[PDB]
Design a protein around this nucleic acid. Structure first.
Ligand SMILES: [K+]
Ligand SMILES: [Mg+2]
Ligand SMILES: [Mg+2]
Ligand SMILES: [Mg+2]
Ligand SMILES: [Mg+2]
Ligand SMILES: [Mg+2]
Ligand SMILES: [Mg+2]
Ligand SMILES: [Mg+2]
Ligand SMILES: [Mg+2]
Ligand SMILES: [Mg+2]
Ligand SMILES: [Mg+2]
Ligand SMILES: [Mg+2]
Ligand SMILES: [Mg+2]
Ligand SMILES: [Mg+2]
Ligand SMILES: [Mg+2]
Ligand SMILES: [Mg+2]
Ligand SMILES: [Mg+2]
Ligand SMILES: [Mg+2]
Ligand SMILES: [Mg+2]
Ligand SMILES: [Mg+2]
Ligand SMILES: [Mg+2]
Ligand SMILES: [Mg+2]
Ligand SMILES: [Mg+2]
Ligand SMILES: [Mg+2]
Ligand SMILES: [Mg+2]
Ligand SMILES: [Mg+2]
Ligand SMILES: [Mg+2]
Ligand SMILES: [Mg+2]
Ligand SMILES: [Mg+2]
Ligand SMILES: [Mg+2]
Ligand SMILES: [Mg+2]
Ligand SMILES: [Mg+2]
Ligand SMILES: [Mg+2]
Ligand SMILES: [Mg+2]
Ligand SMILES: [Mg+2]
Ligand SMILES: [Mg+2]
Ligand SMILES: [Mg+2]
Ligand SMILES: [Mg+2]
Ligand SMILES: [Mg+2]
Ligand SMILES: [Mg+2]
Ligand SMILES: [Mg+2]
Ligand SMILES: [Mg+2]
Ligand SMILES: [Mg+2]
Ligand SMILES: [Mg+2]
Ligand SMILES: [Mg+2]
Ligand SMILES: [Mg+2]
Ligand SMILES: [Mg+2]
Ligand SMILES: [Mg+2]
Ligand SMILES: [Mg+2]
Ligand SMILES: [Mg+2]
Ligand SMILES: [Mg+2]
Ligand SMILES: [Mg+2]
Ligand SMILES: [Mg+2]
Ligand SMILES: [Mg+2]
Ligand SMILES: [Mg+2]
Ligand SMILES: [Mg+2]
Ligand SMILES: [Mg+2]
Ligand SMILES: [Mg+2]
Ligand SMILES: [Mg+2]
Ligand SMILES: [Mg+2]
Ligand SMILES: [Mg+2]
Ligand SMILES: [Mg+2]
Ligand SMILES: [Mg+2]
Ligand SMILES: [Mg+2]
Ligand SMILES: [Mg+2]
Ligand SMILES: [Mg+2]
Ligand SMILES: [Mg+2]
Ligand SMILES: [Mg+2]
Ligand SMILES: [Mg+2]
Ligand SMILES: [Mg+2]
Ligand SMILES: [Mg+2]
Ligand SMILES: [Mg+2]
Ligand SMILES: [Mg+2]
Ligand SMILES: [Mg+2]
Ligand SMILES: [Mg+2]
Ligand SMILES: [Mg+2]
Ligand SMILES: [Mg+2]
Ligand SMILES: [Mg+2]
Ligand SMILES: [Mg+2]
Ligand SMILES: [Mg+2]
Ligand SMILES: [Mg+2]
Ligand SMILES: [Mg+2]
Ligand SMILES: [Mg+2]
Ligand SMILES: [Mg+2]
Lengths: 154, 386
RNA sequence: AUAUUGGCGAGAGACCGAUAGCGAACAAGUACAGUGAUGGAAAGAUGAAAAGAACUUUGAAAAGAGAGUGAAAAAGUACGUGAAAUUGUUGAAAGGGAAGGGCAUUUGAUCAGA
RNA sequence: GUCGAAUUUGGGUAUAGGGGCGAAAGACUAAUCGAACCAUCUAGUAGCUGGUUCCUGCCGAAGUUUCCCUCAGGAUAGCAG
RNA sequence: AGAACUGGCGAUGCGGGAUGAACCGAACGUAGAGUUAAGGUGCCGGAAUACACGCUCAUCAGACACCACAAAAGGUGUUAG
RNA sequence: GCCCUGAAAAUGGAUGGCGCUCAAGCGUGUUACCUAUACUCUACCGUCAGGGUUGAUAUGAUGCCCUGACGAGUAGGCAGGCGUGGAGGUCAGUGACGAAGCCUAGACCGUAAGGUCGGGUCGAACGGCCUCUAGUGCAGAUCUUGGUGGUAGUAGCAAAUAUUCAAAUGAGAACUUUGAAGACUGAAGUGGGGAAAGGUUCCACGUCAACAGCAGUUGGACGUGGGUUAGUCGAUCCUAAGA
RNA sequence: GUGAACAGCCUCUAGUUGAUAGAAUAAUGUAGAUAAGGGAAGUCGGCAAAAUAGAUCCGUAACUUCGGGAUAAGGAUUGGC
RNA sequence: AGAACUGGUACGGACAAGGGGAAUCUGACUGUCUAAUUAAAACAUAGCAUUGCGAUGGUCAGAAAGUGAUGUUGACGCAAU
RNA sequence: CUAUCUAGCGAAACCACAGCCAAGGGAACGGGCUUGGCAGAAUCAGCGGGGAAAGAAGACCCUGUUGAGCUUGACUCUAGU
RNA sequence: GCGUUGGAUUGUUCACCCACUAAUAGGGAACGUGAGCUGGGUUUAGACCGUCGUGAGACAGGUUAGUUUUACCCUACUGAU
RNA sequence: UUGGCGGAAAGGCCUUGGGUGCUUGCUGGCGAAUUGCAAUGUCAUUUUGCGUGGGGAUAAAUCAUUUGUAUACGACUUAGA
């Protein structure tokens, strides 16, 4: 409970979240923004295509020195990627939200991702060893992901 | 302090930037000055670089040590099937330069040129020029009105011609369309020539002739990202050099506190537009003429194609232009051959060249025989046949 | 009669209030480092009471969504409050090689006073 | 480079800090050596470097005199409150 | 680099000298009005492409002190003696 | 006198720029005009100075009021105030009907330090005034402790020849198991044992949150257990340098 | 097994197949190589690299402490049957 | 060890495996050291020379000792250069 | 084999604020200031001009009434003899 | 505008000579240019000599040996979206 | 509505005929007030959206696959009913 700021009707909505998920926060933020606002079935199909490397996730903020591809053209970018782990976690949350909408009795054909946000979970800490007997951090950047799908109405 | 030893700088600053040309077809940036007493003629032609071979000819150069002697020379063969005229463009002059007033297209355009207007031809409905061809519905009144505008204006007239790639061995199947300036007088009859030649072919023998100096305009062979040592020809640093030696050591003084545009840097090499001038036409050969590769001294009834085909190109079946030496671009590339911009009279031009022999041994190896008949005659009967 | 940063037992304070106060409010001279002499931390707080979430549902599962307990779950043991740095989403606005600022006013948003 | 003897090496053993050990480089003596490490004296001293935490109001300087083992410091007079 | 007298800067913003510790003007609570300083008034830029008498044409013209340079020697260039 | 020659330096550049030629240049003269925190007048704030007013309802005589002048400032001095922890007194002060704290391009007061109010959050204490007291105010100290960024999904995860097919298991297999194949160590081994050291890492079963810088169903991991059998092998005994 | 050989190289028994992978094949690198003609002109300097190399036979200088120098130098041969 | 035959005159066919010579400076040599920038011509060395000392002694330890090293020694020795 | 692109994993140095120039003046070599030139999102691979780039309170030099290693008929002592 | 060289000796800058050439001009750019190289020199610590010093040690005197680190950021530049 | 001219950025200029409105060229009739003594006292043109009618047209590009005249990645060049 107590999701991020949402402006939708909770009666026509269904929520899903996952916390302390050991998946790259930056990649997952880009993945979530890729489907923010999309219809549920369109977003799920797009995510399967991303997994299949037919479409890509445009990397808009966390994209420094990543790489360029022609699959970013449909989003008006040169920098896009295929963050399979982030996509799989987002698909798990999407199907959980779809199940919750079904249990609420919502119209599955009117569901669109009305809210999706990723923020940084506490970092899991490891150590890496460096020249001249030095030790640096080797931490993960896990994610809290939350989303709510709502019935589109007028 | 000063350089401490003078050398010329590496590379030509007038060929900057060493970037990829914006098109695979190099633009003709200047046409020959119009002499409006001559008849209407194209100022250039489009062809495809097939490859090089070697010829033998008697040099005619009084005072040369090889005068009336035999010289072996390298030549480039450009496959030049006739170009189809499909349009005409009128250019009015303005205080801001030349400006196209209007273009009048032919009524029927072949699929070759129509493909040029499509990124995805196979799945299109091929609507290109379908409403335009209705401008010729009953009287062509709109077409004649546009041609009258061109006559009443348009100090410069260019035809739109396209190549016939279907006549080349290329797999491309998409024609190349270019504007060729019409030289010759009476812009009115420039327009008349273009209109009468709509949908019709113009052969290379009506544009170019034997011994004529021509210029070749083509995009050079691309070589991708290149380091300074080969991109600019800078000295290789000594073997002892830490961090690599295929570099420029000092890329600049402390001041200006900037790398200057004139310092050699690593970047793209090749795929540049080049206009190289003064290549003499050694042959204007015709595709229908068997004995294309023959001369008045050889008489071997053979075409210009080397045994086994022009490597990476195929067989020459069309009209072809054989120029002396080499021209920019690689095999299969579209090249624009244009008339020279000045009247060269240097005795290297103006020389009447008569070929004595044209090599047709295979370029796929150390070719030994000019013809399969000569190969059979030398080798005798082999086990397979012959 | 005098001394007493040790021991045992007591009573107190204009002292400190978890980076403070002894190093140690807690399984602290502990964990850990060093061959060794020695060095030596961090670490308190759900709630009145576990009433610590039965049961349903999606998920391989972790968990989610419900349901429920509770005064409160904006208290769920990753637990009182829950700042800032930094971050996500939404909303608003601006943006030709920084941004920020001063005086004045336009515009938009917002608001007290009679 | 050297590779059958001034050889290489395990274990045991002895030598301990102004001490040892040195086919000698001030080398080595537990990543420490032109004097090891540990703790204490010790919060060592510093004319030298850095910092020195709220507001407003009023007044408002000196780099000059003499003396100093003094010349990056102080005393003294002057200027200031 | 070192002295004398004064005025400054340091310790001081403000208008001017494009810019600048020290020059010019003027020293400062918060505002309003008027007038000025030094400096300016083609446009940047507020303010006369003002008025008046002359001089100068530079194939490196000249254009405000401090201040950001130029000399000897020359020229039927031109002007006045 | 003006102009010209004399008159040569290094990135492209400077009457400030543009540009200006009976000037917008030079010399000179006359007016008009522009504008500084300066001058003049006025208001307000404060400071200083000189005064008036204890004759009553009159509580602020350190008060009220009148008059004039002044106001730059480092180092520094002094004064009047703001705020914090604790203490004596008082307001029979506030408070679970919500104290403190925190958030709040919402409001008010003060030149300011600051003070006050509304809304949200929250949960148990706290404040005004008169005094007392100090471990009492932070932007800096390569400050201390802790936390967090940009760098950045970047550098990189490239020595030791090398992997491949299928099946099984499993939610999930490049990495687990089995089979097949291809290879290597090539007996001075990547084999079989031991000494020092480690201490259960051995083995089985279960099992993947963390760890194995990818993965993981596997493991020297995690959880639970099992396991080391001596008259003859060692120690034990002897002496060595030595203690 | 080859070979003088515990060298290198290949194999048997035994063991392992463990090093993050997939796709491309730009520059510049790291590591390994080749190069016409010239042959140290490079560079402080032949640094680096190249050339030589095993065995058999022939031949072997100055100098010498008579022991060496010496594999001096310089040549020839080598398979299979 | 030799002969005939044989072949794209190849044949230590991979692997493995000295470049050589004429000289100069310097240290005789083998050996040793600056672990982690110096391997050397530096140190050592055999050889040579000098010095002290006959034990109630030379040289050197220890705070002191009824204490030690050389010394289980004795000048062909020990100690110091 | 990297670099490159991808899946997964994922640091560090450094960081007043930042990042286009020319001249000027200025602590006499500006990213900011003045006057000009100019100036259009977001970017990828390279690169070594600049950031008087980073690394370290300059090791040279000087100063300090700060040391230490070493030496000597420095001053003052001392074990031993 | 355009070019202004190849070498012997030397770390050398400089110099000098050989030689070609149209000519072998002078200079700047942090005495341009070391996260471009190299490291011969200078300029740590090893060592030798000469002179000097009683000595430790000194020497614009000679000699030999002596670790040359980091870019992935911003800009600039080269290319590329 | 007729005809013509205008391509430098024409996008406007001229012209024909009829219709229709106004005419302040001249002479009358009626109206206006209270916006309260002023308050721009709203009269212009810039885009966009929606609705009502009417006319008109009936594609491409990208990804993915493919090519190698291209290429680090993007990009480029090709092919595919
Ligand atoms: K010392
Ligand atoms: Mg980038
Ligand atoms: Mg990269
Ligand atoms: Mg490491
Ligand atoms: Mg280590
Ligand atoms: Mg020069
Ligand atoms: Mg070339
Ligand atoms: Mg090197
Ligand atoms: Mg060929
Ligand atoms: Mg504590
Ligand atoms: Mg807590
Ligand atoms: Mg609560
Ligand atoms: Mg909490
Ligand atoms: Mg915050
Ligand atoms: Mg020494
Ligand atoms: Mg202190
Ligand atoms: Mg004062
Ligand atoms: Mg004295
Ligand atoms: Mg000082
Ligand atoms: Mg001062
Ligand atoms: Mg002043
Ligand atoms: Mg000036
Ligand atoms: Mg004006
Ligand atoms: Mg003169
Ligand atoms: Mg002059
Ligand atoms: Mg002016
Ligand atoms: Mg004048
Ligand atoms: Mg005023
Ligand atoms: Mg008074
Ligand atoms: Mg004051
Ligand atoms: Mg206290
Ligand atoms: Mg409250
Ligand atoms: Mg705020
Ligand atoms: Mg409570
Ligand atoms: Mg304090
Ligand atoms: Mg702070
Ligand atoms: Mg401060
Ligand atoms: Mg700090
Ligand atoms: Mg810290
Ligand atoms: Mg990477
Ligand atoms: Mg690597
Ligand atoms: Mg490997
Ligand atoms: Mg297997
Ligand atoms: Mg091997
Ligand atoms: Mg093997
Ligand atoms: Mg096991
Ligand atoms: Mg892992
Ligand atoms: Mg895992
Ligand atoms: Mg276990
Ligand atoms: Mg026994
Ligand atoms: Mg044998
Ligand atoms: Mg060669
Ligand atoms: Mg050769
Ligand atoms: Mg030779
Ligand atoms: Mg040489
Ligand atoms: Mg040379
Ligand atoms: Mg030399
Ligand atoms: Mg070598
Ligand atoms: Mg020999
Ligand atoms: Mg010899
Ligand atoms: Mg020796
Ligand atoms: Mg030997
Ligand atoms: Mg060493
Ligand atoms: Mg060494
Ligand atoms: Mg010696
Ligand atoms: Mg500049
Ligand atoms: Mg200057
Ligand atoms: Mg700067
Ligand atoms: Mg500016
Ligand atoms: Mg920009
Ligand atoms: Mg680099
Ligand atoms: Mg740089
Ligand atoms: Mg210092
Ligand atoms: Mg220091
Ligand atoms: Mg002193
Ligand atoms: Mg001392
Ligand atoms: Mg220099
Ligand atoms: Mg540099
Ligand atoms: Mg360097
Ligand atoms: Mg240098
Ligand atoms: Mg050197
Ligand atoms: Mg030295
Ligand atoms: Mg002497
Ligand atoms: Mg010296």
């Amino acid at each position: 409970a107590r999701y991020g700021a949402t402006s939708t009707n909770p009666a026509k909505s269904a929520s899903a979240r996952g916390s302390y998920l050991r998946v790259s926060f930056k990649n997952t933020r880009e993945t979530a923004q890729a489907i923010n606002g999309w219809e549920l079935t369109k977003a799920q199909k797009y995510l399967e295509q991303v997994l299949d490397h037919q479409r890509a996730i445009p990397f808009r903020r966390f994209n420094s020195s990543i790489g360029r591809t022609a699959q970013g053209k449909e989003f008006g970018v040169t920098k896009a990627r295929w963050p399979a782990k982030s996509v799989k976690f987002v698909q798990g949350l999407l199907q959980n939200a779809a199940a919750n909408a079904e249990a609420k009795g919502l119209d599955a054909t009117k569901l669109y991702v009305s809210h999706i946000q990723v923020n940084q979970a506490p970092k899991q800490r490891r150590r890496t060893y460096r020249a001249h007997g030095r030790i640096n951090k080797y931490e993960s950047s896990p994610s809290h992901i939350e989303l709510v799908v709502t019935e589109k109405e007028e | 302090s000063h350089r401490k030893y003078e050398a010329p700088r590496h590379g030509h600053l007038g060929f900057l930037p060493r970037k990829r040309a914006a098109s695979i077809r190099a633009r003709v940036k200047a046409f020959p000055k119009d002499d409006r007493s001559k008849p209407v003629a194209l100022t250039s032609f489009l062809g495809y670089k097939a490859g090089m071979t070697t010829i033998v000819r008697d040099l005619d150069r009084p005072g040369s040590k090889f005068h009336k002697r035999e010289v072996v020379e390298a030549v480039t063969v450009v496959d030049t099937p006739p170009v189809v005229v499909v349009g005409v463009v009128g250019y009015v002059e303005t205080p801001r330069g030349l400006r196209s007033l209007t273009t009048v297209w032919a009524e029927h355009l072949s699929d070759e040129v129509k493909r040029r207007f499509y990124k995805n031809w196979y799945k299109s409905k091929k609507k290109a020029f379908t409403k335009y061809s209705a401008k010729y519905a009953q009287d062509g009144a709109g077409i004649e009105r546009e041609l009258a505008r061109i006559k009443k204006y348009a100090s410069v007239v260019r035809v739109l011609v396209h190549t016939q790639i279907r006549k080349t061995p290329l797999a491309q199947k998409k024609a190349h369309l270019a504007e060729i300036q019409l030289n010759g007088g009476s812009i009115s009859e420039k327009v008349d020539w273009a209109r009468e030649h709509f949908e019709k072919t113009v052969a290379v023998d009506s544009v170019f002739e034997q011994n004529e100096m021509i210029d070749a305009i083509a995009v050079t062979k691309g070589h991708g990202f290149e380091g300074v040592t080969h991109r600019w020809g800078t000295k290789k640093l000594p073997r002892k050099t830490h961090r690599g030696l295929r570099k420029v050591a000092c890329i600049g003084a402390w001041h200006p506190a900037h790398v200057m545009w004139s310092v050699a840097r690593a970047g793209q090499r090749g795929y540049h537009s080049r206009t190289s001038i003064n290549h003499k036409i050694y042959r204007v050969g015709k595709g229908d003429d068997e004995a294309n590769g023959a001369t008045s001294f050889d008489r071997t009834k053979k075409t210009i194609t080397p045994m086994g085909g022009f490597v990476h190109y195929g067989e020459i079946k069309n009209d072809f232009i054989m120029v002396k030496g080499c021209i920019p671009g690689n095999r299969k590339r579209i090249v624009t051959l244009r008339k020279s911009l000045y009247t060269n009279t240097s005795r290297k031009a103006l020389e009447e060249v008569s070929l004595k022999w044209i090599d047709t041994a295979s370029k796929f190896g150390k070719g030994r025989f000019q013809t399969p008949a000569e190969k059979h005659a030398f080798m005798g009967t082999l086990k397979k046949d012959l």
